[PDB]
Write a structure and sequence with these properties.
This is part of a larger assembly, with chains A (48 residues), B (127 residues), C (97 residues) and D (57 residues). Chain C is mainly β and 97 residues long. Chain C is built from no helices and nine strands. Chain D has one helix and four strands. The complex binds potassium ion (K) (7 copies), magnesium ion (46 copies), sodium ion (4 copies) and zinc ion. The site of one magnesium ion (MG) has 3 residues of chain B, from loops. Chain B binds four RNA strands through residues 1-5, 7-8, 11, 19-27, 29-32, 34, 41, 58, 61-62, 65-66, 68-73, 75-77, 91-100, 102, 104, 109, 114, 119-120, 122. Chain C: One of its GO terms (cellular component) is ribosome.
RNA sequence: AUAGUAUAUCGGUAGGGGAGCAUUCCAGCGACGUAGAAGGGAAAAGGGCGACUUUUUCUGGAGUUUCUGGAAAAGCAAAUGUAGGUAUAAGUAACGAUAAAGGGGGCGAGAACCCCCCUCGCCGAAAGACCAAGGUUUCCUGAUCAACGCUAAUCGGAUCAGGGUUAGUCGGGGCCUAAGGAUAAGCCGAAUGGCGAUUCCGAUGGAAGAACCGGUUAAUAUUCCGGUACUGAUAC
RNA sequence: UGAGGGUAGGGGUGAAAGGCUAAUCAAACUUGGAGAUAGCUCGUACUCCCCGAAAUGCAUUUAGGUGCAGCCUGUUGGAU
RNA sequence: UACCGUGAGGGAAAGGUGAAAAGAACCUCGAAAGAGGAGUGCAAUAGACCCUGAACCCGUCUGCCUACAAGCGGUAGGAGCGCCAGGUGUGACUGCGUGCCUUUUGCAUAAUGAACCUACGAGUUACUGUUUGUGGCAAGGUUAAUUGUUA
RNA sequence: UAAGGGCAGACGGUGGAUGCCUAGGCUCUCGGAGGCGAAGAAGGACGUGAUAAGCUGCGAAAAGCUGCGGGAAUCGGCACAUACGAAUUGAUCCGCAGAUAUCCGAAUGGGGCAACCCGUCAGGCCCCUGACACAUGAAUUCAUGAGCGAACGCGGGGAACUGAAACAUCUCAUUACCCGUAGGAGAAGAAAACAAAAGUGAUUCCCUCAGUAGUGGCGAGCGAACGGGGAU
């Protein structure tokens, strides 16, 4: 059967990528929380 | 302070009169191996080698090569080739060794554990 | 600074080789140990690469080694004096090496 | 369908009374002198019932 | 408990009261320990009663402790209680489409399963061939069989090392714009901001710049080589 | 049927089944307020000694909760 | 961090050889894995998952009992046998005996709960009162913030 | 008698408790300090070794370059082995000042799916490649700002569960949370003030006053000031 995750690299970066996070105040708020935690992976732009 | 040196000296002097061989960490289940140990316990070594060679259990081939070693240890510690009809299996035991855990999937997303067991085998020979 | 160095002649003051003198061969600064010639031999088991057991000096912790007096043959503590600084033997007062 | 209780050590060991490895039916080879299974060709010499059966190189 | 040995009294849930033991650490006076401390195994003996204590011996190989007072992370049998380990059911269910296997050689300690050969069987609008998405070295070769492979394995999409992807034209990108997105001038609005062009971005579409057949490697091939073409720039 | 866009939680979307909104829907998920509240259920660990109940009355948005009385116990003073 | 999730986010386990690698040359059995020796070392039953090394759970050996026997598995008696001077292991035969916890008027209950072991796990502290045991001062008792000296 | 079983002991297996230990935590005291960034930050990507996965350091000058002060025989990081070298003409190492410092990121020449693509302008080499500049907004070419980051401050907005043994006033609470913006602190601050014929004179903070005067479906609750003693 068709499952929930059907990958598309173009969709992934448009929805969760680094440049989309930086485009809004609430996205930059997410980046600040992940930096303060010390995450090695900041966005999906890192795993690529 | 020499106490453990004196305890160990007596331990080594007794080992000169004991003829044995060991198998450690054999990657097969101890219960199946025990089935083979009960077959050759207290039996003349020449007859046991043939019994192990033509056994239908797979654990017997490993045990056959350990009995050969036990006999050779006997001749090293006694300084003569063993006769025929002379030695016999005076002691044998199988102990469970450490277990390797694995995973086998089951229906509806559940997972079960598989145990891949091991064992140790020790054989004594005697005239 | 260390109270001994390569080329020094030192006497062992503790351990099984106490009362024995000898020359310093190598100094392991980080571990604070040194090789003294002819003392603390070991039987190392080497595979061919013809093989066999071979002899080598094992290092002794440097706090068990004292510089031998220039004049007398006994081990002494040392100091440094400006007469740059230079080592000298506390038992006799003469400069060392 | 389900065990109401775990079995004690005694009950488990009593059931395992009849779990025995079967001994081979062995015979000595009149030619080689080696052990072989009765009614089979000796794998060492190749002989069977006094005659050569598997001439082994 | 009363009287100072005598009289009485001593079954107990909820519950009230009294008196103690062990544990960790601190102060003080002091002890023990490589001629063997703590911990762990065995044995013996004690206590108005008990919580507990003491001694001997084996292991162990460096810390331990009496008494008086002080302070608490100060005691488990059960919470469908938590972690780690090990049992029972049990050598039981099961080993994942009923397309199918048999023989002879080979390497090898070892072969139902690996390699070669003969026969048999299954798919064949596919279970064959070429791309896209996605994956990211799984591709080829040598060595290895611990783990992985629902068996074994000399084999493998497994482990380690080495090697392997070649473009003027192919596919992209460079050019163009759609949905939508970001904006300019402006408009709106506690803040954060929301809107807003013919502007820009953005292919899944449009391009007036153009290549196809064959052969070679263990692994690449409109890319390398052969043959035969085409398209921009640039200099005379 | 492929690619890329858009609508976001009392909101969306619905040829309307309270269907669907990442195996979750009569109000998604994540973190925080937060150890919400639970007159309810379950659980509550060393020792010995002395004493030892109640399951009634009244009141209560009260009835399997609670307040006061009644009945237990410590200390203290009186005799009753 | 690994791992889980489209994402926001969630989020582990895992310390110790020995004073010193002196980290086991060489031989024997094995195709080699594994062991027996040798050697190093205070010690290898310190040999790499290595200090100590408990329980549940699992083996081998020795002693006694057990194939006419029927219930929470013990308890109180009691021969024989085996070991080391009256202690210890076993237990023929006999009497009595329906686990434990919790919840209940009342549970062997066919009401609840637990596979077992080791480890973890639940009336604590602060402040303000009140009663009481023990003390200081007493017709009086007591300082708070803070200040001085010393260190 | 024992196919088997029961109990006890001896010796082992497994497992990793306990004892001992520490390399890391926890709570504080005293002193200092309280930022970094367009001269490009925080945080990253990619590289960098005789050998080189990963960390560490560093940036195409890439485990590093140059001076000054210190110091004295070893050194080429964790970190081995092998290999080649450095150094008493002073190596490594420490303190201070310099040199170099790719790409992304406020990111700022334009775009963009972060670490990429595409330009104009002036110079120099030769289809390409060097080395400059080129955002926007608020002031007068010039000067400035932007972004990031503990808590404490001041502003703009602002819940509910909960308590009231129900609940709407009330409470939780001018809290959580969201947003803006300073400083080493900030805010306040020099009487159109308190007091009561007696007086004190800016602000802030501590001890009292006091659970008092009051307030309140006069319920649950909430709760001063004057005056006095201090710090300054
Ligand atoms: K202790
Ligand atoms: K191969
Ligand atoms: K909602
Ligand atoms: K053990
Ligand atoms: K009988
Ligand atoms: K029931
Ligand atoms: K740019
Ligand atoms: Mg196995
Ligand atoms: Mg077989
Ligand atoms: Mg599935
Ligand atoms: Mg059976
Ligand atoms: Mg009585
Ligand atoms: Mg009583
Ligand atoms: Mg259950
Ligand atoms: Mg069955
Ligand atoms: Mg069956
Ligand atoms: Mg199945
Ligand atoms: Mg079956
Ligand atoms: Mg199959
Ligand atoms: Mg196909
Ligand atoms: Mg392949
Ligand atoms: Mg296999
Ligand atoms: Mg391969
Ligand atoms: Mg093209
Ligand atoms: Mg355009
Ligand atoms: Mg190919
Ligand atoms: Mg071709
Ligand atoms: Mg309906
Ligand atoms: Mg769903
Ligand atoms: Mg709701
Ligand atoms: Mg709250
Ligand atoms: Mg709660
Ligand atoms: Mg009574
Ligand atoms: Mg009720
Ligand atoms: Mg009452
Ligand atoms: Mg030991
Ligand atoms: Mg150990
Ligand atoms: Mg009868
Ligand atoms: Mg009932
Ligand atoms: Mg009752
Ligand atoms: Mg009853
Ligand atoms: Mg029953
Ligand atoms: Mg119930
Ligand atoms: Mg149950
Ligand atoms: Mg029950
Ligand atoms: Mg229990
Ligand atoms: Mg339990
Ligand atoms: Mg044991
Ligand atoms: Mg421990
Ligand atoms: Mg210098
Ligand atoms: Mg209420
Ligand atoms: Mg500032
Ligand atoms: Mg100030
Ligand atoms: Na001892
Ligand atoms: Na416990
Ligand atoms: Na028996
Ligand atoms: Na440069
Ligand atoms: Zn034969």
């Amino acid at each position: 059967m068709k499952r929930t995750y059907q990958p598309s690299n173009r969709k992934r970066l448009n929805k969760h990528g680094f440049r989309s996070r930086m485009a809004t105040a609430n996205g930059r708020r997410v980046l600040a929380a992940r930096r303060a935690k010390g995450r090695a992976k900041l966005t999906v732009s890192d795993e690529f | 302070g020499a106490r453990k040196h004196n305890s160990a000296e007596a331990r080594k002097e007794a080992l000169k009169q004991m003829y044995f061989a060991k198998l450690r960490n054999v990657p097969t289940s101890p219960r199946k191996m025990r089935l083979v140990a009960d077959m050759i316990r207290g039996m003349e070594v020449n007859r046991a080698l043939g019994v192990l060679k033509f056994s239908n259990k797979e654990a017997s081939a490993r045990v056959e090569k350990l009995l050969r070693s036990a006999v050779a240890n006997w001749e090293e510690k006694n300084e003569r080739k063993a006769e025929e009809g002379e030695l016999f299996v005076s002691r044998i035991c199988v102990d469970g060794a450490s277990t390797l855990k694995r995973l086998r999937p089951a229906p509806q997303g559940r997972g079960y554990r598989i145990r891949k067991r091991s064992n140790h085998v020790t054989i004594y020979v005697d005239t | 600074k260390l109270h001994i160095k390569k080329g020094d002649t030192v006497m062992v003051i503790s351990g099984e080789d106490k009362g024995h003198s000898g020359r310093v061969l190598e100094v392991l600064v980080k571990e604070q140990r040194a090789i003294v010639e002819g003392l603390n031999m070991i039987k190392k088991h080497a595979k061919p690469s013809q093989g066999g057991i071979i002899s080598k000096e094992a290092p002794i912790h440097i706090s068990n080694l004292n510089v031998v007096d220039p004049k007398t043959g006994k081990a002494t503590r040392i100091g440094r004096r400006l007469n740059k600084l230079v080592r000298y033997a506390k038992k006799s007062g003469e400069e060392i090496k | 369908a389900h065990p109401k209780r775990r079995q004690s050590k005694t009950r488990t060991a009593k059931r395992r009374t009849h779990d025995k490895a079967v001994m081979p039916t062995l015979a000595k080879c009149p030619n080689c002198g080696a052990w072989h299974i009765y009614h089979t060709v000796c794998g060492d010499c190749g002989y069977y019932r006094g005659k050569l059966a598997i001439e082994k190189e």
